[PDB]
Amino acid sequence: AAALQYILANQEFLLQFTPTLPGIFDVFLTTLGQPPVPRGSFTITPPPTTVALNMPPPRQLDFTDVGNDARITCDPYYQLAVCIFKDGQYVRVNPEKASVVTNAPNRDLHFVLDLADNHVLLYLCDVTPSGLGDRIAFPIVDIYRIAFPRNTPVRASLPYTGGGAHLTSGGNPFMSLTTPPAVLPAGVALAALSTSVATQYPTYTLPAGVYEYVIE
């Protein structure tokens, strides 16, 4: 926005300008006959854009399809804003699990928990440009801190395309991360909701159980 109000008595023009784009604007003299002479330079200014993740409000771990509300405090620039990296650029999040949704307080993230997150960190990331992370990315430490209770099941999905056979309940191997037939016990079953960073193998449910999230 630019606003221009003519004030006779005062010989002044009110200038309301938006701090947007870096730019240093050159102004020239107006009075009648319009003589060749400049006055100087006016500077337009880049915006404060901060994006901050806020805690899931209940102390409760929604390891289901509903997941949980990890709110965002953002200056209104970008929606559906979770990312990681792809050979040289950045690779966009699974669309099921990373639902930044609704005309709630600010930006509301309803994120489906997954053990994947033991061998992987995501960033809350600038969407709007044809390039990711210009108006920053928020390293989402908050989500990585996944807990393993022995009363609500734990869902695990292919954390990346490498060999995670070492998925273990006190040592014993289970539904290993990428292997020709995994050891599916009587408390495990595969999660139709393909909440996996990768295509090859989708999410499964491990039971009420503590599992060592390890690679080879």
PDB file of C-alpha atoms in Angstrom:
ATOM      1  CA  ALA A   1       0.000   0.000   0.000  1.00  0.00           C
ATOM      2  CA  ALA A   2       0.849   3.587  -0.912  1.00  0.00           C
ATOM      3  CA  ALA A   3      -1.058   6.607   0.248  1.00  0.00           C
ATOM      4  CA  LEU A   4      -0.689  10.150  -0.853  1.00  0.00           C
ATOM      5  CA  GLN A   5      -2.396  13.008   0.975  1.00  0.00           C
ATOM      6  CA  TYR A   6      -2.035  16.585  -0.121  1.00  0.00           C
ATOM      7  CA  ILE A   7      -1.655  19.129   2.608  1.00  0.00           C
ATOM      8  CA  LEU A   8      -1.726  22.631   1.293  1.00  0.00           C
ATOM      9  CA  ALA A   9      -1.077  24.700   4.348  1.00  0.00           C
ATOM     10  CA  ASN A  10       1.792  22.492   5.413  1.00  0.00           C
ATOM     11  CA  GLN A  11       3.485  21.814   2.051  1.00  0.00           C
ATOM     12  CA  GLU A  12       3.544  18.166   2.920  1.00  0.00           C
ATOM     13  CA  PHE A  13       2.444  14.908   1.398  1.00  0.00           C
ATOM     14  CA  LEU A  14       1.826  11.982   3.675  1.00  0.00           C
ATOM     15  CA  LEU A  15       3.619   8.916   2.590  1.00  0.00           C
ATOM     16  CA  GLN A  16       2.407   5.532   3.711  1.00  0.00           C
ATOM     17  CA  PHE A  17       4.431   2.881   2.053  1.00  0.00           C
ATOM     18  CA  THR A  18       4.705  -0.910   2.601  1.00  0.00           C
ATOM     19  CA  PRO A  19       8.017  -2.413   3.768  1.00  0.00           C
ATOM     20  CA  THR A  20       8.236  -5.137   1.243  1.00  0.00           C
ATOM     21  CA  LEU A  21      11.049  -5.461  -1.332  1.00  0.00           C
ATOM     22  CA  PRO A  22      14.680  -4.299  -0.978  1.00  0.00           C
ATOM     23  CA  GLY A  23      14.869  -1.236  -3.039  1.00  0.00           C
ATOM     24  CA  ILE A  24      16.340   2.202  -2.797  1.00  0.00           C
ATOM     25  CA  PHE A  25      14.040   4.715  -4.571  1.00  0.00           C
ATOM     26  CA  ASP A  26      15.120   7.894  -6.115  1.00  0.00           C
ATOM     27  CA  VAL A  27      12.999  10.966  -5.766  1.00  0.00           C
ATOM     28  CA  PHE A  28      13.025  14.043  -7.956  1.00  0.00           C
ATOM     29  CA  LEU A  29      11.742  17.515  -7.359  1.00  0.00           C
ATOM     30  CA  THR A  30       8.115  18.520  -8.001  1.00  0.00           C
ATOM     31  CA  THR A  31       7.085  22.141  -8.445  1.00  0.00           C
ATOM     32  CA  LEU A  32       5.656  23.509 -11.631  1.00  0.00           C
ATOM     33  CA  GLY A  33       8.284  23.715 -14.367  1.00  0.00           C
ATOM     34  CA  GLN A  34       9.938  20.509 -13.277  1.00  0.00           C
ATOM     35  CA  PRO A  35      13.687  21.214 -13.204  1.00  0.00           C
ATOM     36  CA  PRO A  36      16.318  18.441 -13.415  1.00  0.00           C
ATOM     37  CA  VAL A  37      17.360  17.788  -9.834  1.00  0.00           C
ATOM     38  CA  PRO A  38      16.975  14.843  -7.445  1.00  0.00           C
ATOM     39  CA  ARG A  39      16.478  14.863  -3.699  1.00  0.00           C
ATOM     40  CA  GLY A  40      17.544  11.446  -2.650  1.00  0.00           C
ATOM     41  CA  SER A  41      16.741   7.880  -1.806  1.00  0.00           C
ATOM     42  CA  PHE A  42      13.894   6.109   0.042  1.00  0.00           C
ATOM     43  CA  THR A  43      14.375   2.577   1.359  1.00  0.00           C
ATOM     44  CA  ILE A  44      11.825  -0.133   1.379  1.00  0.00           C
ATOM     45  CA  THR A  45      12.332  -2.857   3.890  1.00  0.00           C
ATOM     46  CA  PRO A  46      12.126  -6.684   4.234  1.00  0.00           C
ATOM     47  CA  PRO A  47       9.555  -8.102   6.581  1.00  0.00           C
ATOM     48  CA  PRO A  48       9.870  -9.903   9.912  1.00  0.00           C
ATOM     49  CA  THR A  49       8.839 -13.446   9.178  1.00  0.00           C
ATOM     50  CA  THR A  50       9.169 -15.880  12.119  1.00  0.00           C
ATOM     51  CA  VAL A  51       7.794 -19.456  12.221  1.00  0.00           C
ATOM     52  CA  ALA A  52       7.616 -21.227  15.563  1.00  0.00           C
ATOM     53  CA  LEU A  53       6.258 -24.564  16.580  1.00  0.00           C
ATOM     54  CA  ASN A  54       4.099 -24.732  19.665  1.00  0.00           C
ATOM     55  CA  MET A  55       3.469 -27.725  21.822  1.00  0.00           C
ATOM     56  CA  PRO A  56       0.664 -30.306  21.624  1.00  0.00           C
ATOM     57  CA  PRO A  57      -1.552 -28.963  24.389  1.00  0.00           C
ATOM     58  CA  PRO A  58      -2.438 -32.173  26.202  1.00  0.00           C
ATOM     59  CA  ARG A  59       0.434 -34.242  27.554  1.00  0.00           C
ATOM     60  CA  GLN A  60      -0.930 -37.073  25.525  1.00  0.00           C
ATOM     61  CA  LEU A  61       0.614 -39.019  22.654  1.00  0.00           C
ATOM     62  CA  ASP A  62      -1.805 -39.470  19.797  1.00  0.00           C
ATOM     63  CA  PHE A  63      -0.181 -42.356  17.929  1.00  0.00           C
ATOM     64  CA  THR A  64      -3.218 -42.828  15.719  1.00  0.00           C
ATOM     65  CA  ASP A  65      -4.819 -41.542  12.486  1.00  0.00           C
ATOM     66  CA  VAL A  66      -5.920 -38.318  14.247  1.00  0.00           C
ATOM     67  CA  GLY A  67      -2.359 -37.555  15.435  1.00  0.00           C
ATOM     68  CA  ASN A  68      -1.809 -34.381  17.480  1.00  0.00           C
ATOM     69  CA  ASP A  69      -1.895 -30.585  17.537  1.00  0.00           C
ATOM     70  CA  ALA A  70       1.526 -29.079  17.291  1.00  0.00           C
ATOM     71  CA  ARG A  71       0.470 -25.571  16.633  1.00  0.00           C
ATOM     72  CA  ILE A  72       2.370 -22.885  14.610  1.00  0.00           C
ATOM     73  CA  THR A  73       3.024 -19.251  15.366  1.00  0.00           C
ATOM     74  CA  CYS A  74       3.730 -17.756  11.925  1.00  0.00           C
ATOM     75  CA  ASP A  75       3.529 -14.464  10.133  1.00  0.00           C
ATOM     76  CA  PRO A  76       0.883 -15.243   7.452  1.00  0.00           C
ATOM     77  CA  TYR A  77       2.977 -16.346   4.434  1.00  0.00           C
ATOM     78  CA  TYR A  78       2.845 -20.145   3.948  1.00  0.00           C
ATOM     79  CA  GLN A  79       0.454 -22.988   4.554  1.00  0.00           C
ATOM     80  CA  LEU A  80       1.185 -26.683   4.767  1.00  0.00           C
ATOM     81  CA  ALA A  81       4.701 -26.190   5.609  1.00  0.00           C
ATOM     82  CA  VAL A  82       6.704 -29.316   6.505  1.00  0.00           C
ATOM     83  CA  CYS A  83       9.803 -30.452   4.679  1.00  0.00           C
ATOM     84  CA  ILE A  84      13.004 -32.341   4.375  1.00  0.00           C
ATOM     85  CA  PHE A  85      15.725 -32.637   1.718  1.00  0.00           C
ATOM     86  CA  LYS A  86      16.047 -34.029  -1.766  1.00  0.00           C
ATOM     87  CA  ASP A  87      19.243 -34.274  -3.737  1.00  0.00           C
ATOM     88  CA  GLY A  88      20.144 -30.600  -3.695  1.00  0.00           C
ATOM     89  CA  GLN A  89      16.753 -29.122  -3.107  1.00  0.00           C
ATOM     90  CA  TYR A  90      14.061 -30.007  -0.564  1.00  0.00           C
ATOM     91  CA  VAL A  91      11.634 -32.799  -0.484  1.00  0.00           C
ATOM     92  CA  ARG A  92       8.072 -32.238   0.483  1.00  0.00           C
ATOM     93  CA  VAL A  93       6.386 -33.985   3.338  1.00  0.00           C
ATOM     94  CA  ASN A  94       3.936 -36.923   3.188  1.00  0.00           C
ATOM     95  CA  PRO A  95       0.477 -35.366   2.622  1.00  0.00           C
ATOM     96  CA  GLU A  96      -1.408 -37.605   5.043  1.00  0.00           C
ATOM     97  CA  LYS A  97       0.486 -36.936   8.268  1.00  0.00           C
ATOM     98  CA  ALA A  98       1.490 -33.304   8.093  1.00  0.00           C
ATOM     99  CA  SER A  99      -1.780 -31.568   8.078  1.00  0.00           C
ATOM    100  CA  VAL A 100      -1.387 -27.918   8.772  1.00  0.00           C
ATOM    101  CA  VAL A 101      -5.091 -27.122   8.867  1.00  0.00           C
ATOM    102  CA  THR A 102      -7.815 -24.756   9.876  1.00  0.00           C
ATOM    103  CA  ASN A 103      -9.032 -21.294  10.792  1.00  0.00           C
ATOM    104  CA  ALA A 104      -8.046 -21.933  14.374  1.00  0.00           C
ATOM    105  CA  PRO A 105      -5.416 -20.219  16.425  1.00  0.00           C
ATOM    106  CA  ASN A 106      -2.902 -19.240  13.769  1.00  0.00           C
ATOM    107  CA  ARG A 107      -1.601 -22.397  12.035  1.00  0.00           C
ATOM    108  CA  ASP A 108      -2.737 -25.731  13.448  1.00  0.00           C
ATOM    109  CA  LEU A 109      -0.628 -28.855  12.825  1.00  0.00           C
ATOM    110  CA  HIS A 110      -2.320 -32.156  13.271  1.00  0.00           C
ATOM    111  CA  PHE A 111       0.568 -34.544  12.887  1.00  0.00           C
ATOM    112  CA  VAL A 112       0.400 -38.307  12.796  1.00  0.00           C
ATOM    113  CA  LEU A 113       3.148 -39.655  15.005  1.00  0.00           C
ATOM    114  CA  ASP A 114       5.596 -42.184  13.655  1.00  0.00           C
ATOM    115  CA  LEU A 115       8.685 -43.984  14.903  1.00  0.00           C
ATOM    116  CA  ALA A 116      10.377 -43.070  11.606  1.00  0.00           C
ATOM    117  CA  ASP A 117      11.210 -39.957  13.386  1.00  0.00           C
ATOM    118  CA  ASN A 118      14.076 -41.696  15.316  1.00  0.00           C
ATOM    119  CA  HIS A 119      16.283 -41.576  12.232  1.00  0.00           C
ATOM    120  CA  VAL A 120      14.905 -38.356  10.849  1.00  0.00           C
ATOM    121  CA  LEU A 121      14.339 -34.627  11.484  1.00  0.00           C
ATOM    122  CA  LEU A 122      11.839 -32.421   9.573  1.00  0.00           C
ATOM    123  CA  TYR A 123      11.809 -28.674   9.039  1.00  0.00           C
ATOM    124  CA  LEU A 124       8.854 -26.233   9.152  1.00  0.00           C
ATOM    125  CA  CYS A 125       9.519 -24.640   5.846  1.00  0.00           C
ATOM    126  CA  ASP A 126       8.761 -21.764   3.517  1.00  0.00           C
ATOM    127  CA  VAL A 127       6.391 -22.779   0.805  1.00  0.00           C
ATOM    128  CA  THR A 128       5.525 -19.725  -1.250  1.00  0.00           C
ATOM    129  CA  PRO A 129       8.533 -19.318  -3.489  1.00  0.00           C
ATOM    130  CA  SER A 130       9.776 -21.724  -6.205  1.00  0.00           C
ATOM    131  CA  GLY A 131      12.492 -22.617  -3.762  1.00  0.00           C
ATOM    132  CA  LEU A 132      12.255 -23.989  -0.266  1.00  0.00           C
ATOM    133  CA  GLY A 133      13.588 -22.306   2.899  1.00  0.00           C
ATOM    134  CA  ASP A 134      13.935 -18.708   1.755  1.00  0.00           C
ATOM    135  CA  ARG A 135      11.532 -17.314   4.379  1.00  0.00           C
ATOM    136  CA  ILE A 136      13.147 -19.794   6.699  1.00  0.00           C
ATOM    137  CA  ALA A 137      12.648 -23.304   7.889  1.00  0.00           C
ATOM    138  CA  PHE A 138      11.943 -24.199  11.535  1.00  0.00           C
ATOM    139  CA  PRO A 139      13.936 -27.313  12.606  1.00  0.00           C
ATOM    140  CA  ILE A 140      11.155 -29.225  14.368  1.00  0.00           C
ATOM    141  CA  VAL A 141      12.999 -30.738  17.283  1.00  0.00           C
ATOM    142  CA  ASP A 142       9.747 -31.216  19.142  1.00  0.00           C
ATOM    143  CA  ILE A 143       8.520 -34.025  16.975  1.00  0.00           C
ATOM    144  CA  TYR A 144      11.699 -36.146  17.136  1.00  0.00           C
ATOM    145  CA  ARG A 145      11.170 -36.811  20.860  1.00  0.00           C
ATOM    146  CA  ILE A 146       9.077 -39.860  20.418  1.00  0.00           C
ATOM    147  CA  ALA A 147       8.201 -41.987  23.412  1.00  0.00           C
ATOM    148  CA  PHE A 148       7.657 -45.717  23.567  1.00  0.00           C
ATOM    149  CA  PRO A 149       4.957 -46.675  26.144  1.00  0.00           C
ATOM    150  CA  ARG A 150       4.019 -50.179  27.073  1.00  0.00           C
ATOM    151  CA  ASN A 151       0.340 -49.500  26.854  1.00  0.00           C
ATOM    152  CA  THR A 152      -0.398 -47.618  23.573  1.00  0.00           C
ATOM    153  CA  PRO A 153       0.940 -49.101  20.363  1.00  0.00           C
ATOM    154  CA  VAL A 154       3.746 -47.550  18.408  1.00  0.00           C
ATOM    155  CA  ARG A 155       3.568 -47.007  14.650  1.00  0.00           C
ATOM    156  CA  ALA A 156       6.644 -47.395  12.515  1.00  0.00           C
ATOM    157  CA  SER A 157       7.199 -46.397   8.929  1.00  0.00           C
ATOM    158  CA  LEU A 158      10.166 -46.533   6.573  1.00  0.00           C
ATOM    159  CA  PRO A 159      12.441 -43.815   7.923  1.00  0.00           C
ATOM    160  CA  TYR A 160      14.450 -43.952   4.655  1.00  0.00           C
ATOM    161  CA  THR A 161      15.288 -46.333   1.895  1.00  0.00           C
ATOM    162  CA  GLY A 162      18.260 -47.904   3.755  1.00  0.00           C
ATOM    163  CA  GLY A 163      18.418 -51.048   5.714  1.00  0.00           C
ATOM    164  CA  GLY A 164      16.648 -50.951   9.038  1.00  0.00           C
ATOM    165  CA  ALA A 165      16.408 -54.591   9.932  1.00  0.00           C
ATOM    166  CA  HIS A 166      17.622 -53.889  13.430  1.00  0.00           C
ATOM    167  CA  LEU A 167      14.208 -52.946  14.690  1.00  0.00           C
ATOM    168  CA  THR A 168      14.022 -54.725  17.990  1.00  0.00           C
ATOM    169  CA  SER A 169      12.056 -55.314  21.195  1.00  0.00           C
ATOM    170  CA  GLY A 170      14.761 -55.841  23.762  1.00  0.00           C
ATOM    171  CA  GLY A 171      16.920 -57.301  21.053  1.00  0.00           C
ATOM    172  CA  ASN A 172      14.487 -59.601  19.297  1.00  0.00           C
ATOM    173  CA  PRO A 173      13.855 -58.692  15.690  1.00  0.00           C
ATOM    174  CA  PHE A 174      10.371 -57.630  14.551  1.00  0.00           C
ATOM    175  CA  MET A 175       8.764 -56.128  11.461  1.00  0.00           C
ATOM    176  CA  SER A 176      12.087 -54.976  10.279  1.00  0.00           C
ATOM    177  CA  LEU A 177      12.564 -51.770   8.161  1.00  0.00           C
ATOM    178  CA  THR A 178      12.939 -53.096   4.646  1.00  0.00           C
ATOM    179  CA  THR A 179      13.582 -56.873   4.557  1.00  0.00           C
ATOM    180  CA  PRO A 180      12.270 -59.966   2.752  1.00  0.00           C
ATOM    181  CA  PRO A 181       9.699 -61.376   5.083  1.00  0.00           C
ATOM    182  CA  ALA A 182       9.752 -59.557   8.355  1.00  0.00           C
ATOM    183  CA  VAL A 183       8.950 -61.299  11.644  1.00  0.00           C
ATOM    184  CA  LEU A 184       5.339 -60.293  12.171  1.00  0.00           C
ATOM    185  CA  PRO A 185       4.226 -61.360  15.666  1.00  0.00           C
ATOM    186  CA  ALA A 186       0.699 -61.489  17.031  1.00  0.00           C
ATOM    187  CA  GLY A 187       0.702 -57.828  18.069  1.00  0.00           C
ATOM    188  CA  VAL A 188       1.750 -56.317  14.739  1.00  0.00           C
ATOM    189  CA  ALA A 189      -0.156 -55.277  11.679  1.00  0.00           C
ATOM    190  CA  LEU A 190       0.312 -52.980   8.729  1.00  0.00           C
ATOM    191  CA  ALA A 191      -1.077 -49.486   8.591  1.00  0.00           C
ATOM    192  CA  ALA A 192      -3.173 -48.804   5.536  1.00  0.00           C
ATOM    193  CA  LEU A 193      -2.546 -45.135   6.141  1.00  0.00           C
ATOM    194  CA  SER A 194       0.790 -45.017   4.265  1.00  0.00           C
ATOM    195  CA  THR A 195       2.456 -42.534   6.451  1.00  0.00           C
ATOM    196  CA  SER A 196       5.973 -43.299   5.185  1.00  0.00           C
ATOM    197  CA  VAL A 197       8.559 -40.826   3.861  1.00  0.00           C
ATOM    198  CA  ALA A 198       9.084 -43.487   1.231  1.00  0.00           C
ATOM    199  CA  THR A 199       7.103 -45.412  -1.367  1.00  0.00           C
ATOM    200  CA  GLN A 200       8.667 -48.849  -1.169  1.00  0.00           C
ATOM    201  CA  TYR A 201       7.525 -49.664   2.410  1.00  0.00           C
ATOM    202  CA  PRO A 202       4.548 -48.267   4.330  1.00  0.00           C
ATOM    203  CA  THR A 203       3.718 -47.736   7.957  1.00  0.00           C
ATOM    204  CA  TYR A 204       2.988 -50.585  10.338  1.00  0.00           C
ATOM    205  CA  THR A 205       1.696 -50.976  13.863  1.00  0.00           C
ATOM    206  CA  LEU A 206       3.967 -52.308  16.518  1.00  0.00           C
ATOM    207  CA  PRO A 207       2.245 -53.134  19.821  1.00  0.00           C
ATOM    208  CA  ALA A 208       2.441 -51.716  23.283  1.00  0.00           C
ATOM    209  CA  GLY A 209       6.200 -51.983  23.213  1.00  0.00           C
ATOM    210  CA  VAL A 210       9.653 -50.545  23.432  1.00  0.00           C
ATOM    211  CA  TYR A 211      11.581 -50.980  20.167  1.00  0.00           C
ATOM    212  CA  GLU A 212      15.194 -50.156  19.380  1.00  0.00           C
ATOM    213  CA  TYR A 213      15.106 -48.002  16.353  1.00  0.00           C
ATOM    214  CA  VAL A 214      18.251 -49.120  14.530  1.00  0.00           C
ATOM    215  CA  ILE A 215      19.815 -49.325  11.197  1.00  0.00           C
ATOM    216  CA  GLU A 216      22.755 -51.641  10.240  1.00  0.00           C
TER     217      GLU A 216
END
